[PDB]
Design a protein around this nucleic acid. Structure first.
Lengths: 205, 85, 167
RNA sequence: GCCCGGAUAGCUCAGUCGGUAGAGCAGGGGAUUGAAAAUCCCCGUGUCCUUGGUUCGAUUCCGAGUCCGGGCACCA
RNA sequence: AAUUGAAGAGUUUGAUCAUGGCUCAGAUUGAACGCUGGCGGCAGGCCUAACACAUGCAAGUCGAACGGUAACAGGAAGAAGCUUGCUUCUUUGCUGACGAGUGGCGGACGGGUGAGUAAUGUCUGGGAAACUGCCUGAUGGAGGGGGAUAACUACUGGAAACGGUAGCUAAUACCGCAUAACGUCGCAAGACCAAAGAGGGGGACCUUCGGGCCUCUUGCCAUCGGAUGUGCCCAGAUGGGAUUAGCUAGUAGGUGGGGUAACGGCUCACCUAGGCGACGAUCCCUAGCUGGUCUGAGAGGAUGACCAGCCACACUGGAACUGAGACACGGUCCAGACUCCUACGGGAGGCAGCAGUGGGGAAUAUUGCACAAUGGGCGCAAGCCUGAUGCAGCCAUGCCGCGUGUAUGAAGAAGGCCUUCGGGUUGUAAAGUACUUUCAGCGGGGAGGAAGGGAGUAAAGUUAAUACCUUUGCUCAUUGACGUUACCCGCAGAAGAAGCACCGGCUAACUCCGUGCCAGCAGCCGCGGUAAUACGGAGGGUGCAAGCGUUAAUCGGAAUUACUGGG
């Protein structure tokens, strides 16, 4: 799992950004994004529709760094679920524990959030958890397990959260090193630059 | 095959002999009956049965023959004698 | 048997029987080191006494495993094994060989017995089936057969054409 | 296990009677056409198993050792 | 609140629309191979040879049915040994319990395999002519005798296997007689059949002082049912073949005897000449069936390995036996083949039980651990057996999860690479600086799976009884294969951890050089003859990720078998 390649390279490919280069050197740019993801990257191929949609899904996966398989599982899970499966999917990926950590901003990327997770730094409700994929149920209280709390990285992290966004559906505590996931994020909320439906049909094939 | 559990086998023979003897004995009287039946003399026939009865039912109770069968002989036979006697 | 014997390190017991004898090895099917049974694959060490079970003769044991360097290593009896498989096919080959031999033997040089006369004292005859076996095994150039068979050396007449070949 | 012989240019294969390794295969190229066909012209081509000794000549004597096909010693 | 699900592309032509085949994009697997490979949990794991098999173990238990005691340990004796009263040794079942035996229960379960079987099978739903150990409800019984036999003596056959002869003895083994009814036969009247005790404790009396007797417990016998399992019958469903069209004489039906637990051509005798068949008889090939599994939006198609029912088979063919039940996987007997013993006269053997071995194959593992948990067999119970089972080993084999780091980092390093030789690029990538510390690693701590059972005691039922005993509490000593357990703790340290395919169209993604119809690639179209984005290599990328590809097979797309849904 975990792509772990040049974190930024993907933003160069997708023509967008995964915000992996959070705030300090700030705006990516210092990378020459899009200009040439690989070798003769200056080219802008027609990109047949299968390609634009494939690129769409890749884009999303890359964002949350999820592997194709587990991602598909999420897809299918979203399929059986009520509601236009499309946005239901986002309801799934946002529920990502690690991703919640990024939302709660204890990390600065998704990767950082994983490392926090794998290293048990974040207990939830009344238990430490290491499965970054631990789906986070509504009204789920969760915080950094104090034994590893106050690692300066989280300090600077929350400080970097100011210039982030502060997602509304969630209930971050910030000061006391805590966060509480309320209701599942509505489609209208997050990014919206992506057209999840694109991924939906992507598996129509 | 050899096992102490195989003892069953020999003990089974120690039964068959005894068991088989009884069966023959049973059938034996029955023979007499039919013989007397074929003889056509109801008195001796009836009697032949008169003694064939206790033994066959006894075998039934002994568990040698599933009771019902003993009755089957008794019935069809009585039907035979009454048919003639 | 309590008898002792040197062995190339790590050789399979399947090889072992051959050190005892080739034939016992063909019929070899079992071995129980320290009484405990083990496959052929168990390489020997520590001079452990090796109980060996066998059978009759029909085999091709590790001859079904020769191609992988897996089971029955070495080459001594190993080659001997191939030999057995070989003698079987050899007889088969011999029959087929006999056929093809007659072919050449009559198509060119003429008279198969004379070809044996063109064989009895040509290549290591020993027997004659020896001369009748190689025919199917390709064990004899499969060309010189014509050359021995064509032992004739007239000469002068060829010069009349050698003088012409030079023309 | 004893022991025994067969081991050739890139192929098939001459010679391997102790004496300057070459014949057929295609081949690659030449001349032809955009290429072939058709067709003309040319031959390129090695450590004789690799290697030591008796040899002026060893690829034809005698070994290692391997190879390949044998006969037998090989039953605990 | 209990499905929201359905994409197309290439390919015939100078070109077009048709039609229309081939092929492709997905999912799928008991997979195999190649490459590569770190951990965890979960499943999976011989599909071919239902081929052969060394060893081990895979089914035993009850002394509370019994005569006994070969053994293990206590008691009765004496001599002796000698720590002279301190121990060692010699006879008997007396006890504790216990080899062999008699005997009851089990061995028909559980486990395996899918050969056979196209229907004596299964599924479905029906039906009546049945039976049914252990268990349970009810009704009663349970008296009185006898003949044995192994064991075990003694002699004896044989290499062995396995016996033989003559005597010794018991019982819940066995067999009479009595006794039986809402049992059987019978219209009835009538006839007839049942068995067994064992153990525990105990006041009085009885005392042949071996016990009687009393109470408790459980066993035993007949009948009645209940539950359960098993047998049977019919309809419908249950592969392909018509270049298989007729088949059939116990065949179809009847009557009568016989037959089994029961119906019945189940079987015989005689009588009738029918019976099945185009809504496929019969014959031929193939197959275990279903619940389901796979695919599909569905309808369908494919399949039926794991888990589960059912059925069939257990070296091959055959027959019975005991028994409630088998025509019996580790029972018998016969024959056959094949291994093996053999003193050759004559015997022994059956892993398609778990492991395992040889073999076959592309291919599928340990000759492990514990009966601790569940269940099963025996037994009052304690217990004993348990390759069912619970586990652990093995293998990326599939599913899922996680890790191989994180942040920052412009000199846009070097080096490789391409260049229109300016530069772009590789590439924040690395280094560097700074932080965390999953699993690894080592070291600490530490569950749950455990319920029971035992010992004790108290109470209640109990009866003559504060006995035994049943039940119910309560106390105490205990029961863990997995197992350096799950999980939690600590320590150290970026430390130990990324590969595989493709990159012409299909189809995500490029260049450079190498080669020149050669070498080569290919699923289809097709690439390659000097400037290959397709071949080989380098670079860069694309996709997926401890996996990636190929082959394998199935549905898909295929509305190219079309009911849905074509002509």
């Amino acid at each position: 799992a975990r792509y772990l390649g040049p974190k930024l390279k993907l933003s160069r490919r997708e023509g967008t950004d995964l915000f992996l280069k959070s705030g300090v050197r700030a705006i990516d740019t210092k990378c020459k994004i899009e200009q040439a993801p690989g070798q003769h990257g200056a080219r802008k191929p027609r990109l047949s529709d299968y390609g634009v949609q494939l690129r769409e899904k890749q884009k999303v996966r890359r964002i949350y760094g999820v592997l194709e398989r587990q991602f598909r599982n999420y897809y299918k899970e979203a399929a059986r679920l009520k509601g236009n499966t499309g946005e239901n999917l986002l309801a799934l990926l946002e529920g990502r524990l690690d991703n919640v950590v990024y939302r709660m901003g204890f990390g600065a990327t998704r990767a950082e959030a994983r490392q926090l997770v794998s290293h048990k730094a974040i207990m939830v409700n009344g238990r430490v958890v290491n499965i970054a994929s631990y789906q986070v149920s509504p009204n789920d209280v969760v915080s950094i397990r104090e034994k590893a709390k106050k690692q300066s990285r989280v300090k600077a992290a929350l400080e970097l959260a100011e210039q982030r966004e502060k997602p509304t559906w969630l209930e971050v505590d910030a000061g006391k090193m805590e966060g509480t996931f309320k209701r599942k994020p509505e489609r209208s909320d997050l990014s919206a630059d992506i057209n999840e439906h694109l991924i939906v049909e992507l598996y129509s094939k | 095959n050899i096992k102490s559990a195989k003892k069953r086998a020999i003990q089974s023979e120690k039964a068959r002999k005894h068991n088989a003897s009884r069966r023959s004995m049973m059938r034996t009287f029955i023979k007499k009956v039919y013989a007397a039946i074929e003889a056509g003399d109801k008195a001796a026939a009836q009697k032949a049965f008169n003694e064939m009865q206790p033994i066959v039912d006894r075998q039934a109770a002994k568990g040698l023959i599933h009771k019902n069968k003993a009755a089957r002989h008794k019935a069809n036979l009585t039907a035979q004698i009454n048919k003639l006697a | 048997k309590g008898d002792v014997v040197d062995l190339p390190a790590g050789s399979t017991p399947l090889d072992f029987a051959y050190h005892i004898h080739s034939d016992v090895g063909h019929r070899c099917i079992g071995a129980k080191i320290g009484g405990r049974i083990v496959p052929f694959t168990y390489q020997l060490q520590m001079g452990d006494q090796i109980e060996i079970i066998t059978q009759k003769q029909p085999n091709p044991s590790r001859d079904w495993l020769n191609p992988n360097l897996g089971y029955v290593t070495t080459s001594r009896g190993r080659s001997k094994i191939h030999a057995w498989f070989r003698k079987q096919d050899r007889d088969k080959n011999i029959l087929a060989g006999r056929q093809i031999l007659d072919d050449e033997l009559e198509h060119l040089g003429i008279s198969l017995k004379e070809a044996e006369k063109h064989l009895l004292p040509r290549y290591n005859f020993n027997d004659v089936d020896e001369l009748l076996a190689a025919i199917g095994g390709g064990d004899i150039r499969l060309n010189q057969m014509v050359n021995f068979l064509q032992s004739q050396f007239n000469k002068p007449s060829a010069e009349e054409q050698d003088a012409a070949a030079l023309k």
